Design an enzyme around this catalytic site. Structure first.
Site, mmCIF file in Angstrom:
data_model
loop_
_atom_site.group_PDB
_atom_site.id
_atom_site.type_symbol
_atom_site.label_atom_id
_atom_site.label_comp_id
_atom_site.label_asym_id
_atom_site.label_seq_id
_atom_site.Cartn_x
_atom_site.Cartn_y
_atom_site.Cartn_z
ATOM 1 N N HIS A 77 0.841 -1.234 0.093
ATOM 2 C CA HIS A 77 0.076 -0.079 -0.070
ATOM 3 C C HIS A 77 1.058 1.321 0.100
ATOM 4 C CE1 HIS A 77 -2.989 3.202 0.899
ATOM 5 N NE2 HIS A 77 -3.806 2.322 1.366
ATOM 6 N N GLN A 122 9.315 1.330 6.577
ATOM 7 C CA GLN A 122 8.062 0.839 6.989
ATOM 8 C C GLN A 122 7.433 0.497 5.889
ATOM 9 O OE1 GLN A 122 6.143 3.778 9.603
ATOM 10 N NE2 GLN A 122 4.422 2.663 9.925
ATOM 11 N N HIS A 135 -0.898 13.951 7.000
ATOM 12 C CA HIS A 135 -1.005 12.843 7.822
ATOM 13 C C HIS A 135 -2.098 13.090 8.634
ATOM 14 C CE1 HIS A 135 -1.077 8.801 9.388
ATOM 15 N NE2 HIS A 135 -0.741 9.206 10.373
HETATM 16 CU CU LIG Z 1 -0.406 2.619 3.400
HETATM 17 CU CU LIG Z 2 -0.638 8.692 12.531
HETATM 18 NA NA NA Z 3 3.735 4.616 14.326
#
Ligand SMILES: [Cu+2]
Ligand SMILES: [Cu+2]
Ligand code: NA
Ligand code: NI
Length: 310
Positions: A63, A126, A198
């Site tokens: 993703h 990540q 975010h």
């Molecule tokens: Cu994602």
């Molecule tokens: Cu967050």
């Molecule tokens: Na985190």
């Protein structure tokens, strides 16, 4: 993308450059929306410059991907679930990869300074995996990022000005809760060339501006539910000693039984604008943060686009 094996993660590109492949150590998940993290110590101890990024992500499964610089990754492990955190110290984001939104390149001559006495000692990668149906054949996964480094000092240095809420409280059912963040900029000029927003599931829109002589120049404005890449700034923006930076995230309380605050877990919220800039090498600093709202009365003259969703 394929697993390396016998050739290792470091490829010399020449006497002073080399490519470092940060990849998942052949990982297999078990549940959906799984979040994985690993760390790579920089191979050189002296200072170097991240000049390029290349995504190596299996197009079926991934993703998004995020890469940070920090000195204390959360786990001294092979890999880990990022619900345990990314870094103990400040995680400096360097690169974001989104599926439905292909990233932009760093401008040539612009680079992140890493390593040395002051630069980051580790990278944390990540990988958010979406659909886990691709593991019916049961192969391992080595998705990640190939990063280009050079000992050659860059004439312009990339940095991160992070704006983020800390004290927001979203009352349940509430229709509109604004989160404002504002700081007066007190360094040498920066040039903002990209932004990432975010928010968790409650954000409607996030937008950051430059305020110079009480006038709002737009940096970025985005729907936080849209894949959270680093999108590029339309017209590049100087920010100078005296200028004030202003961001507002717009939230809703609808469909929530209990009040929502700023936090780690998904049942919490976040209001982060990641303004990505470059500065002249000789003046540059690498990271700035605003967690305050020093000009709250100023927010009355904010553009009304910041209140309607994109
Ligand atoms: Cu994602
Ligand atoms: Cu967050
Ligand atoms: Na985190
Ligand atoms: Ni300029």
């Amino acid at each position: 993308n394929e697993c390396l094996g016998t050739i290792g993660p470091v490829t010399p590109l020449d006497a002073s450059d080399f490519a470092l492949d940060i990849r998942m150590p052949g990982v297999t998940p078990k549940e959906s929306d799984t979040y994985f993290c690993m760390s790579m110590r920089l191979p050189v101890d002296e200072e170097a410059f991240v000049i390029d990024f290349k995504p190596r992500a299996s197009m079926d499964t991934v993703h998004h991907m995020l890469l940070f610089g920090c000195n204390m990754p959360s786990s001294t492990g092979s890999y880990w679930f990022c619900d345990e955190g990314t870094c103990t110290d400040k995680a400096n984001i360097l690169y974001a990869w989104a599926r439905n939104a292909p990233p932009t390149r760093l401008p040539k001559g612009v680079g992140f300074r890493v390593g040395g006495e002051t630069g980051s000692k580790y990278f944390v990668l990540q990988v958010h995996y979406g659909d886990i149906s691709a593991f019916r054949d049961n192969h391992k996964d080595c998705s990640g990022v190939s990063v280009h480094l050079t000992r050659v000092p860059q004439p312009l240095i990339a940095g991160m000005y992070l704006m983020m809420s800390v004290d927001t409280v979203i009352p349940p059912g509430e229709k509109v809760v604004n989160a404002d963040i504002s700081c007066q900029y007190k360094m040498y000029p920066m040039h903002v060339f990209a932004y990432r927003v975010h928010t968790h599931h409650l954000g409607k829109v996030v937008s950051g501006y430059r305020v110079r002589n009480g006038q709002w120049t737009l940096i970025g404005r985005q729907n936080p539910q849209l894949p959270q890449a680093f999108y590029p700034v339309e017209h590049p923006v100087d920010v100078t000693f005296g200028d004030i930076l202003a961001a507002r995230c717009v939230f809703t309380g609808e469909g929530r039984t209990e009040a929502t605050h700023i936090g780690g877990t998904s049942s919490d919220e976040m209001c982060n604008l990641y303004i990505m800039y470059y500065m002249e090498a000789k003046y540059a600093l690498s990271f700035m943060t605003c967690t305050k709202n020093v000009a709250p009365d100023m927010f009355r003259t904010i553009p009304a686009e910041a209140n309607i969703p994109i």
